[PDB]
Design an enzyme around this catalytic site. Structure first.
Site, PDB file in Angstrom:
ATOM      1  N   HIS A  34      -7.292  -6.443  -0.635  1.00  0.00           N
ATOM      2  CA  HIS A  34      -6.298  -5.398  -0.415  1.00  0.00           C
ATOM      3  C   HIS A  34      -5.331  -5.749   0.711  1.00  0.00           C
ATOM      4  O   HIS A  34      -4.152  -5.383   0.647  1.00  0.00           O
ATOM      5  CB  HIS A  34      -6.991  -4.071  -0.110  1.00  0.00           C
ATOM      6  CG  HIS A  34      -6.042  -2.971   0.250  1.00  0.00           C
ATOM      7  ND1 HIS A  34      -5.251  -2.337  -0.683  1.00  0.00           N
ATOM      8  CD2 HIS A  34      -5.747  -2.402   1.443  1.00  0.00           C
ATOM      9  CE1 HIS A  34      -4.515  -1.420  -0.082  1.00  0.00           C
ATOM     10  NE2 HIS A  34      -4.797  -1.439   1.208  1.00  0.00           N
ATOM     11  N   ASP A  62       0.869  -1.186   0.000  1.00  0.00           N
ATOM     12  CA  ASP A  62       0.000   0.000   0.000  1.00  0.00           C
ATOM     13  C   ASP A  62       0.903   1.233   0.000  1.00  0.00           C
ATOM     14  O   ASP A  62       1.769   1.347  -0.883  1.00  0.00           O
ATOM     15  CB  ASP A  62      -0.984  -0.105   1.156  1.00  0.00           C
ATOM     16  CG  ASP A  62      -2.002   1.004   1.148  1.00  0.00           C
ATOM     17  OD1 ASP A  62      -2.868   0.994   0.254  1.00  0.00           O
ATOM     18  OD2 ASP A  62      -1.930   1.888   2.027  1.00  0.00           O
ATOM     19  N   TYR A 120      -1.564  10.841   2.667  1.00  0.00           N
ATOM     20  CA  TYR A 120      -2.376  11.181   1.504  1.00  0.00           C
ATOM     21  C   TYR A 120      -2.355  12.666   1.167  1.00  0.00           C
ATOM     22  O   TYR A 120      -2.813  13.042   0.083  1.00  0.00           O
ATOM     23  CB  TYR A 120      -3.833  10.765   1.731  1.00  0.00           C
ATOM     24  CG  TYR A 120      -4.078   9.276   1.807  1.00  0.00           C
ATOM     25  CD1 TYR A 120      -4.420   8.551   0.673  1.00  0.00           C
ATOM     26  CD2 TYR A 120      -3.995   8.602   3.016  1.00  0.00           C
ATOM     27  CE1 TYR A 120      -4.658   7.192   0.740  1.00  0.00           C
ATOM     28  CE2 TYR A 120      -4.230   7.244   3.093  1.00  0.00           C
ATOM     29  CZ  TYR A 120      -4.562   6.545   1.953  1.00  0.00           C
ATOM     30  OH  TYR A 120      -4.796   5.192   2.029  1.00  0.00           O
TER      31      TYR A 120
HETATM   32  C1  LIG Z   1      -4.382   7.414  -6.537  1.00  0.00           C
HETATM   33  C2  LIG Z   1      -3.521   7.810  -7.738  1.00  0.00           C
HETATM   34  C3  LIG Z   1      -4.445   8.329  -8.836  1.00  0.00           C
HETATM   35  C4  LIG Z   1      -2.788   6.581  -8.268  1.00  0.00           C
HETATM   36  N1  LIG Z   1      -2.555   8.853  -7.399  1.00  0.00           N
HETATM   37  C5  LIG Z   1      -2.273   8.921  -5.969  1.00  0.00           C
HETATM   38  C6  LIG Z   1      -0.990   8.168  -5.613  1.00  0.00           C
HETATM   39  O1  LIG Z   1       0.118   8.889  -6.060  1.00  0.00           O
HETATM   40  C7  LIG Z   1      -0.926   8.008  -4.094  1.00  0.00           C
HETATM   41  O2  LIG Z   1      -0.239   6.822  -3.788  1.00  0.00           O
HETATM   42  C8  LIG Z   1      -1.029   5.844  -3.150  1.00  0.00           C
HETATM   43  C9  LIG Z   1      -0.629   4.515  -3.158  1.00  0.00           C
HETATM   44  C10 LIG Z   1      -1.408   3.551  -2.527  1.00  0.00           C
HETATM   45  C11 LIG Z   1      -2.586   3.907  -1.887  1.00  0.00           C
HETATM   46  N2  LIG Z   1      -3.375   2.860  -1.237  1.00  0.00           N
HETATM   47  C12 LIG Z   1      -4.727   3.015  -0.702  1.00  0.00           C
HETATM   48  O3  LIG Z   1      -5.317   4.041  -0.751  1.00  0.00           O
HETATM   49  N3  LIG Z   1      -5.371   1.865  -0.085  1.00  0.00           N
HETATM   50  C13 LIG Z   1      -6.727   1.999   0.458  1.00  0.00           C
HETATM   51  C14 LIG Z   1      -7.601   0.863  -0.077  1.00  0.00           C
HETATM   52  C15 LIG Z   1      -9.002   0.900   0.529  1.00  0.00           C
HETATM   53  C16 LIG Z   1      -8.972   0.936   2.060  1.00  0.00           C
HETATM   54  C17 LIG Z   1      -8.058   2.038   2.604  1.00  0.00           C
HETATM   55  C18 LIG Z   1      -6.662   1.988   1.986  1.00  0.00           C
HETATM   56  C19 LIG Z   1      -2.978   5.240  -1.881  1.00  0.00           C
HETATM   57  C20 LIG Z   1      -2.204   6.206  -2.509  1.00  0.00           C
END
Ligand SMILES: CC(C)(C)NC[C@@H](O)COc1ccc(NC(=O)NC2CCCCC2)cc1
Ligand SMILES: CC(C)(C)NC[C@@H](O)COc1ccc(NC(=O)NC2CCCCC2)cc1
Ligand SMILES: [Mg+2]
Ligand SMILES: [Mg+2]
EC number: 3.3.2.10
Lengths: 319, 319
Positions: free
Chosen positions: A296, A107, A238
């Protein structure tokens, strides 16, 4: 598979910055393997991998990522951008006297180990990611636009305003983790309707059932861990999308030349396997694993399959 | 030689018993090397060896022995007998997932690593001792008699009564460590006249000069460390002579068959080199080092010579 009792682990602490220490559990001897968990998890998310990798002949360092557990949770939002997080993990290796280590992430931890391999390949013996693909930054469209192009990531917009997602996630910690840590067939939430429903859980049971993946005792460990610093630190991972975008753009063109492994999960409906489709163009020595019937929460959904894939790849490409 | 800054070290903590944790600093990668200090010292006594051994390709674990520093100091005197101390170091390896480690000790730590090799050779890859010889227990004469046969050990009788030696050693910590940590030519005390003079320091300067071996900053680190638990725990290592004698007698006859190294110090007037004269009869693979112009505080008196001897022996017999 054998799990971990928190009270019977060796606990390490490394100060990487004046008010920032990192906590990790350590088990085994051999090549250093650094495990990096995701949101909103813990070193305990690797509980099935730590004894298995150590028995396979590796020195496992399972971190509590910054903002989590016994690691420091500094208040500033910019302290959780990928550039700062990666540089501290380099300092982490420096203080431990480690020239390099294998980095395995899941993740948000998988995103971190990809940029460790991208920006600090001399400090990464090998890199492996669960679910999280490596997609080079597009220097032409903002992160605000790339999320609007994929409605699955609408929950990330709900996570941006500081204090809003914290209030919902911290209101009932047991309900939070019982609702999140579920197999894909047990899921009780839609990441689509979040900003339209006003929250992650508002259309979910307030006394949710225990998923087949976890016990009540394991849920209560996460509850006790997140009582320490709350959800702000974890959520701040985030809240640096543009900052991470500027930094990732500064590496554009270069490939990851170290041994690498991408493990996709069939039933991860957010980090879907097809998001990794053309990582070979940027990672020439990339190997692959794929786990069917896996949601996940890969480490606890299919711990045996995860152990098989990681040990096979470690023994061949990391040793 | 390169020394250690305490704030820039990785600190590990392992719970080996309900109210007993052990603290250690950790540096480097490679075969595990466990360093065990003596009385009344600290992990910091290995400050010149830790970066050198790590640079030579070893994973250094420099302990705070039980009763010292950040390690637990349980109140019971019998908690500091060699049998309990050795069994906890085995549990220490167990919790860390270490099948075995090289054990290097000095003074009381050297006595411990000898009995680790004697009673737990399957958990000791190799053993090295500074100053402390390995003399098999005589099942025919008590420890009370063997000390009366050597007037150099009269200070050990002054250490027996709980609370007496503690009051003198804790009265002025800076004076205590400045008077103890001295080269042999700078010594300011006689271990002969202690029970006749009523103490270790009564015939010593009350504002002693700083030895050439140490700085004021290094002295103050020991002072700050011993403000945590005092001298009772450290002194209790001396208060289990008969218990250690019964336990050592239970191994009589058997040899130490693992690789071993005995390093003698020419000017250690208590643990004199000739006390090690016939250790080869009990340790067939024993190798030797000898440091001229070296007093009791071997690691800080001759750090370069200590590093040369240990790394040469580790690379040949422990790797
Ligand atoms: C999103 C994108 C368009 C690709 N750009 C943003 C990216 O650059 C940010 O990087 C990330 C990498 C991995 C995650 N993983 C999660 O969010 N997992 C969730 C799953 C459901 C339950 C809660 C946790 C989030 C962000
Ligand atoms: C004594 C004997 C007759 C051989 N039996 C007892 C032995 O079984 C106990 O084992 C020991 C091993 C090592 C030490 N080292 C020190 O006392 N070093 C001191 C030097 C001067 C300044 C203060 C520290 C003490 C005891
Ligand atoms: Mg292609
Ligand atoms: Mg002989």
């Amino acid at each position: 598979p054998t799990s971990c009792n928190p009270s019977d682990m060796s606990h390490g602490y490394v100060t990487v910055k004046p008010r920032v220490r990192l906590h990790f559990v350590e088990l085994g001897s051999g090549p250093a393997v650094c495990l990096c968990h995701g949101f909103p998890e813990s070193w305990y998310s690797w509980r099935y991998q730590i004894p298995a990798l150590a028995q396979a002949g590796y020195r496992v360092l399972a971190m509590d990522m910054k903002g989590y557990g016994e690691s420091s949770a500094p208040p500033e939002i910019e302290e959780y951008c990928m550039e700062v997080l990666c540089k501290e993990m380099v300092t982490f290796l420096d203080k431990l006297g480690l020239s390099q280590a294998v980095f395995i992430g899941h993740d948000w931890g998988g995103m971190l180990v990809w940029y460790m391999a991208l920006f600090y390949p001399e400090r990464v013996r090998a890199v492996a990611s669960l679910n999280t693909p490596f997609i080079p930054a597009n220097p032409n469209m903002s992160p605000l636009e790339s999320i609007k192009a994929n409605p699955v990531f609408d929950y990330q917009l709900y996570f941006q305003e500081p204090g809003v997602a914290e209030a919902e996630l911290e209101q009932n910690l047991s309900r939070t983790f019982k609702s999140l840590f579920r197999a894909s067939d047990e899921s009780v939430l839609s990441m689509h309707k979040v900003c339209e429903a006003g929250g992650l859980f508002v259309n979910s049971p307030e006394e949710p059932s225990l998923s087949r993946m976890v016990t009540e005792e394991e849920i209560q460990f996460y509850v006790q861990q997140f009582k320490k610093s709350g959800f702000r630190g974890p959520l701040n991972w985030y809240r640096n999308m543009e900052r991470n975008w500027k930094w990732a753009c500064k590496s554009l063109g270069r490939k990851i030349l170290i041994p690498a492994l991408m493990v996709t999960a069939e039933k991860d409906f957010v980090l879907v396997p097809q998001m990794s489709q053309h990582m070979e163009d940027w990672i020439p020595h990339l190997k692959r694993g794929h786990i069917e019937d896996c949601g996940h929460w890969t480490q606890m959904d299919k711990p045996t399959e995860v152990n098989q894939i990681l040990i096979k790849w470690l023994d061949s490409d990391a040793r």
